[PDB]
Design a protein around this ligand. Structure first.
Ligand SMILES: *[C@@H]1O[C@H](CO)[C@@H](O[C@@H]2O[C@H](CO)[C@@H](O)[C@H](O)[C@H]2NC(C)=O)[C@H](O)[C@H]1NC(C)=O
Ligand SMILES: *[C@@H]1O[C@H](CO)[C@@H](O[C@@H]2O[C@H](CO)[C@@H](O)[C@H](O)[C@H]2NC(C)=O)[C@H](O)[C@H]1NC(C)=O
Ligand SMILES: *[C@@H]1O[C@H](CO)[C@@H](O[C@@H]2O[C@H](CO)[C@@H](O)[C@H](O)[C@H]2NC(C)=O)[C@H](O)[C@H]1NC(C)=O
Ligand SMILES: *[C@@H]1O[C@H](CO)[C@@H](O[C@@H]2O[C@H](CO)[C@@H](O)[C@H](O)[C@H]2NC(C)=O)[C@H](O)[C@H]1NC(C)=O
Ligand SMILES: *[C@@H]1O[C@H](CO)[C@@H](O[C@@H]2O[C@H](CO)[C@@H](O)[C@H](O)[C@H]2NC(C)=O)[C@H](O)[C@H]1NC(C)=O
Ligand SMILES: *[C@@H]1O[C@H](CO)[C@@H](O[C@@H]2O[C@H](CO)[C@@H](O)[C@H](O)[C@H]2NC(C)=O)[C@H](O)[C@H]1NC(C)=O
Ligand SMILES: *[C@@H]1O[C@H](CO)[C@@H](O)[C@H](O)[C@H]1NC(C)=O
Ligand SMILES: *[C@@H]1O[C@H](CO)[C@@H](O)[C@H](O)[C@H]1NC(C)=O
Ligand SMILES: *[C@@H]1O[C@H](CO)[C@@H](O)[C@H](O)[C@H]1NC(C)=O
Ligand SMILES: *[C@@H]1O[C@H](CO)[C@@H](O)[C@H](O)[C@H]1NC(C)=O
Ligand SMILES: *[C@@H]1O[C@H](CO)[C@@H](O)[C@H](O)[C@H]1NC(C)=O
Ligand SMILES: *[C@@H]1O[C@H](CO)[C@@H](O)[C@H](O)[C@H]1NC(C)=O
Ligand SMILES: *[C@@H]1O[C@H](CO)[C@@H](O)[C@H](O)[C@H]1NC(C)=O
Lengths: 428, 322, 121, 49
């Protein structure tokens, strides 16, 4: 691994930071609410009559298991466009409530049902919020919403004082003041009836034929969820590294009993950097605390590959007891586990050192390990030893108050000193 | 660690990260160079002694009292009272929050291993003088050494031999106020505390900057992967990878400048140790205010403290000259 | 500027020891200094005194230090052993005999007295 | 000033700027440190009396 990291077939004496070890998870668990009754997705899509645009109705869906793959057979639509979520995994998420709206418009204005759009129908009739998170479905209904004589049951507002706020409905029928004349009368010039009727007939081509529209609105926030997809819960395991799925929010780590005082309207717990730290179990009202797996840097102490072929391994910042826990079959991110805990395990304040033996000697520092510990390839027939660095040789000085030492000879010494002055000049 | 900071042990994020090139092989080398340089910095200031000298058990140096600076054998760690006062004044939840791959390595030289060097220097300088800077230690009585130091600044040596008791009392009283001045003023060790304060807020900002969205659906890769299909997941997480790389690069860019700022001061401290401590300096205002006589070193967390002993003229009278 | 074009008094700036000379050489992208220094050698220890009291007056060295080989007192330079007879020109007198701690008795040669009393007789 | 340099007193640009993190709290501190250092530089050369 050291050779692969250095991109060379030879290595020199030193200590190299190769990689990071991590403990792999054992199994996976799923925790979803225990809900059985199906959702009423037939009334929304299969109805004999649809409300007009100016009086669009809203239906609440909650406390049921929602399968979104069945509504494909309920209406002959083609697009099924969604904004805040991919339609592929709508079955893998848990929502807190669903809202279904339905109406009938002209084919021209179907493009106006979108966030940030304005027009005749997105200003005075139905305006989506700028941060919409849901789906819009529209399909042609010319064969059952347009008569040869003409259809007049569909109304829409064209005149009003000001643009209406998102998800707000206005059903007032009063004469608009469109002139200096006081519009007190029932009707007249400069006084317009704000509601106009469609003319759906088979004669009109595409773009003028009636279209039937259903809008599904979700909200993906942290709150007690009622409507959920069709997934089966498993048992609850504790104190072991597993893959948990609490109401659709996946993760990885160990779960422990927690002593955090939550509140009935609080379900999740966060911290700085905005990551989940505590969860409330959906099936049973219990609080669990998530802790990540065990990880640690690993370093390889080696003499020059020319000199020998033995290495020692330093696990940085871990106590020597968890290394056997870390060293398990099919449970460690590094593939190699040949070292494991095979003797010569020594606890340094820098970390746990494996493959090197400790001696009661003191030499100069060859390969610095840290915290006053060094290592070197030496004899006790040749192995790798780990010792404590020596600052020098002990030497007591002599002091007396009536004695002085004077030299009687001299020496001339010539030394050398090297200093860089400049580098290369480059151009790009 | 890039792979665990940028990507929270995900696999798709890892594949994109390898697709982005070698921006993190370069990051892993600058920090290693900085760490090796930091280990080398302390080896020049202190490791200037061939051996480890020891002061004699009998301590009578002509009336001068050095008990405030020699090691205390009673305490578990052989540190002088000045050194203990210095250590008890610089202080080194969020630390355990660095589950994001940010760690701190221990220095190679232990605090005891630096106290030993300082004690060796002090024993050599108060037993032998400046002679041990050139070759082996050459013994000389402390009053005669002080007479030579007086003679080196233009004052005759009989002044010391005639005012020895007064000079000893003045030195003892002057050295007895360092503890009071340090323990009274709260901003005494401010240059050393700023070093440890500036290296914690950087890590705190690096951790806190993981919650930003950088113009995406959310700041969590798991939610993005669970709500959006791979064709758009690789577009959403691609806006987080670049932002996190840009956040990571500024950290090492500023550390590369702080390291040079620290290295300049380390070089200055090494020069001061060579010149003020291992000899007598004629440079003006280099080793204190006045005429330099002596200097004594002490160790503090992430730094050194010099005690400069200088000669200051006193009561003046004016005459007529020719 | 400092080591090569002159003699440096700064400690450990131009080598280990007492600086004498320096010579420059050029290397690819850098410079090399050869520092020539003076290092003391074989040491021997004597008994020392701060002052000498001859006529009830204290005598201090002019340039050097008082030293003793066991029975006789000499004055020598600090950095080399070169004993000499204590005369009235190696020393200067300042003060009386009872202010200095560690004073010793001895005699100081007077070069003038025999030369100008034998002839003047 | 970031908020006025990057965004010409617009409101949407400001919203994206707050969304983009705290890269301008760090910019406002380095320049302040440089300015204080500049003020300290001239106080050592001259104020020696
Ligand atoms: C490594 O782990 C062992 C096992 O827990 C530690 O030994 C115990 O440590 C705790 C506190 O960490 C003490 O309260 C116990 O008294 C220790 N038991 C024994 C039998 O010593 C050990 O201390 C850990 N190593 C380090 C450096 O903390
Ligand atoms: C030289 O030897 C020692 C210094 O190492 C000193 O002797 C001590 O002197 C003090 C005060 O003069 C006395 O209180 C001690 O009782 C002495 N101790 C011993 C063991 O003699 C002094 O500097 C010199 N000694 C003499 C006798 O002058
Ligand atoms: C000072 O040291 C020098 C050597 O550095 C001594 O010179 C040596 O003396 C021995 C014995 O006479 C000879 O065998 C060597 O050949 C000499 N060396 C050289 C380079 O000439 C010298 O004797 C010493 N001086 C004193 C007074 O001891
Ligand atoms: C050298 O100084 C120390 C520190 O002032 C002296 O130790 C003090 O001695 C007095 C009198 O015995 C005690 O009341 C203090 O409590 C001591 N202080 C400490 C910190 O221990 C010491 O006596 C001085 N040396 C001599 C020879 O007088
Ligand atoms: C200390 O030095 C004196 C220098 O005078 C030595 O005295 C001389 O010693 C030589 C050799 O024995 C004699 O030939 C001279 O006559 C002595 N001079 C006088 C004036 O008596 C003295 O021997 C030396 N001491 C020791 C212990 O070597
Ligand atoms: C030699 O030194 C001794 C002491 O070291 C001196 O002796 C003192 O002499 C004075 C005056 O004669 C007396 O009052 C003292 O009582 C003496 N003290 C001792 C301890 O003897 C002496 O003066 C010095 N000079 C000579 C020539 O002997
Ligand atoms: C719609 O409902 C009617 C009456 O309940 C039923 O006959 C028809 O099969 C339904 N169509 C679909 C597609 O569910
Ligand atoms: C009714 O709602 C609209 C929606 O924007 C708002 O502008 C208006 O002030 C509200 N009240 C009246 C009386 O129109
Ligand atoms: C079903 O869910 C409720 C939610 O409170 C829980 O109390 C109950 O124990 C669950 N039933 C089973 C069989 O787990
Ligand atoms: C290994 O070392 C020997 C002696 O030090 C040397 O002769 C040889 O060329 C080296 N080989 C390599 C591949 O470094
Ligand atoms: C080495 O030191 C340990 C710890 O003091 C001691 O138990 C052991 O006997 C020593 N061994 C040798 C060979 O000195
Ligand atoms: C000394 O200075 C004072 C004022 O500074 C002056 O009055 C006095 O005359 C001076 N002494 C002599 C001898 O000039
Ligand atoms: C010189 O030192 C040695 C030991 O270092 C000692 O035995 C000897 O007595 C000393 N010489 C004198 C004259 O005191």
């Amino acid at each position: 691994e050291t050779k692969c990291t250095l991109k060379s077939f030879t290595v020199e004496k030193g200590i190299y930071q190769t990689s990071n070890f991590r403990v792999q998870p054992t199994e996976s668990i799923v925790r979803f609410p225990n809900i059985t009754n199906l959702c009423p997705f037939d009334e929304v899509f299969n109805a004999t009559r649809f409300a007009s645009v100016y009086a669009w109705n809203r239906k609440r869906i909650s406390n049921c298991v929602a399968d979104y793959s069945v509504l494909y057979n309920f209406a002959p639509f083609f697009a099924f466009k969604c904004y805040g979520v991919s339609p592929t995994k709508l079955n893998d998420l848990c929502f807190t409530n669903v809202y279904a709206d339905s109406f009938v418009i002209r084919g021209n204005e179907v493009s106006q049902i979108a966030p940030g759009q304005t027009g005749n129908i997105a200003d005075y009739n139905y305006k989506l919020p700028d941060d919409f998170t849901g789906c819009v479905i529209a399909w042609n209904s010319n064969k059952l919403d347009s008569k040869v004589g003409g259809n007049y049951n569909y109304l829409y507002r064209l005149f009003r004082k000001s643009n209406l706020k998102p998800f707000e409905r206005d059903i007032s029928t009063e004469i608009y003041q469109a002139g200096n004349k006081p519009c007190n009368g029932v009707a007249g010039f400069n006084c317009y009836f704000p509601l106009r009727s469609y003319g759906f007939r088979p004669t009109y081509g595409v773009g003028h034929q009636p279209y039937r529209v259903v809008v599904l609105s979700f909200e993906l926030l942290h709150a007690p969820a009622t409507v959920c997809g069709p997934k089966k819960s498993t048992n609850l395991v504790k104190n072991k590294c597993v893959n948990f799925n609490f109401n659709g929010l996946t993760g990885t780590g160990v779960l422990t009993e927690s002593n955090k005082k939550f509140l009935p309207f609080q379900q999740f717990g966060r911290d700085i950097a905005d990551t989940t730290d505590a969860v409330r179990d959906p099936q049973t009202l219990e609080i669990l605390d998530i802790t990540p797996c065990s990880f640690g840097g690993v370093s390889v102490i080696t003499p020059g590959t020319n000199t020998s072929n033995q290495v020692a391994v330093l696990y940085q910042g871990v106590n020597c007891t968890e290394v056997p826990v870390a060293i398990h079959a099919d449970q460690l991110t590094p593939t190699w586990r040949v070292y494991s805990t095979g003797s010569n395990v020594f606890q340094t304040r820098a970390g746990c050192l494996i493959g090197a033996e400790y001696v009661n000697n003191s030499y100069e520092c060859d390969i610095p390990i840290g915290a006053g510990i060094c290592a070197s390839y030496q004899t006790q027939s040749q192995s790798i030893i780990a010792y404590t660095m020596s600052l020098g040789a002990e030497n007591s000085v002599a002091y007396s108050n009536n004695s002085i030492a004077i030299p009687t000879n001299f020496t001339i010494s010539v030394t050398t000193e090297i200093l860089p002055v400049s580098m290369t000049k480059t151009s790009v | 660690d890039c792979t665990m900071y940028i990507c929270g042990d995900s696999t798709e994020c890892s594949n994109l990260l390898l697709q982005y090139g070698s921006f993190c092989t370069q990051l892993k080398r600058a920090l290693t160079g900085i760490a090796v340089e930091q280990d080398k910095n302390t080896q020049e200031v202190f490791a200037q002694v061939k051996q480890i000298y020891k002061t004699p058990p009998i301590k009578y140096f002509g009336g001068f009292n050095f008990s405030q600076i020699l090691p205390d054998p009673s305490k578990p760690s052989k540190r002088s009272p000045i050194e203990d006062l210095l250590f008890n004044k610089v202080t080194l939840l969020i630390c355990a929050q660095k589950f994001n791959g940010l760690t701190v390595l221990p220095p190679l030289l232990t605090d005891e291993m630096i106290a030993q060097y300082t004690s060796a220097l002090l024993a050599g300088t108060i037993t032998s003088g400046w002679t041990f800077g050139a070759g082996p230690a050459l013994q000389i009585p402390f009053p005669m050494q002080m007479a030579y130091r007086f003679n080196g600044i233009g004052v005759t040596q009989n002044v010391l031999y005639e005012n020895q008791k007064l000079i000893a009392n003045q030195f003892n009283s002057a050295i007895g106020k360092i503890q009071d001045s340090l323990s009274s003023t709260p901003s005494a060790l401010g240059k050393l505390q700023d070093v440890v304060n500036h290296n914690a807020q950087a890590l705190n900002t690096l951790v806190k900057q993981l919650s930003s969205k950088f113009g995406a659906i959310s700041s969590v890769l798991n939610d993005i992967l669970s709500r959006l299909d791979p064709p758009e997941a690789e577009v959403q997480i691609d806006r987080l990878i670049t932002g996190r790389l840009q956040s990571l690069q500024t950290y090492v860019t500023q550390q590369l400048i702080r390291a040079a700022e620290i290295r300049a001061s380390a070089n200055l401290a090494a020069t001061k140790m060579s010149e003020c401590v291992l000899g007598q300096s004629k440079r003006v205002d280099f080793c204190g205010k006045g005429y330099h006589l002596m200097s004594f070193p002490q160790s503090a967390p992430h730094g050194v403290v010099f005690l400069h002993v200088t000669y200051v003229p006193a009561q003046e009278k004016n005459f007529t000259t020719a | 500027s400092e080591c090569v074009l002159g003699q440096s008094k700064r400690v450990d700036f131009c080598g280990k020891g007492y600086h004498l000379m320096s010579f420059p050489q050029s290397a690819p992208h850098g410079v090399v200094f050869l520092h020539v220094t003076y290092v003391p050698a074989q040491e021997k220890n004597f008994t020392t005194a701060p002052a000498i009291c001859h006529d009830g007056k204290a005598h201090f060295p002019r340039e050097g230090v008082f030293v003793s080989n066991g029975t006789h007192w000499f004055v020598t330079q600090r950095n080399f052993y070169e004993p000499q007879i204590i005369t009235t020109d190696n020393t200067f007198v300042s003060g009386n005999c009872d202010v200095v701690i560690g004073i010793v008795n001895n005699t100081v040669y007077d070069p003038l007295q025999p030369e100008l009393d034998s002839f003047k007789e």
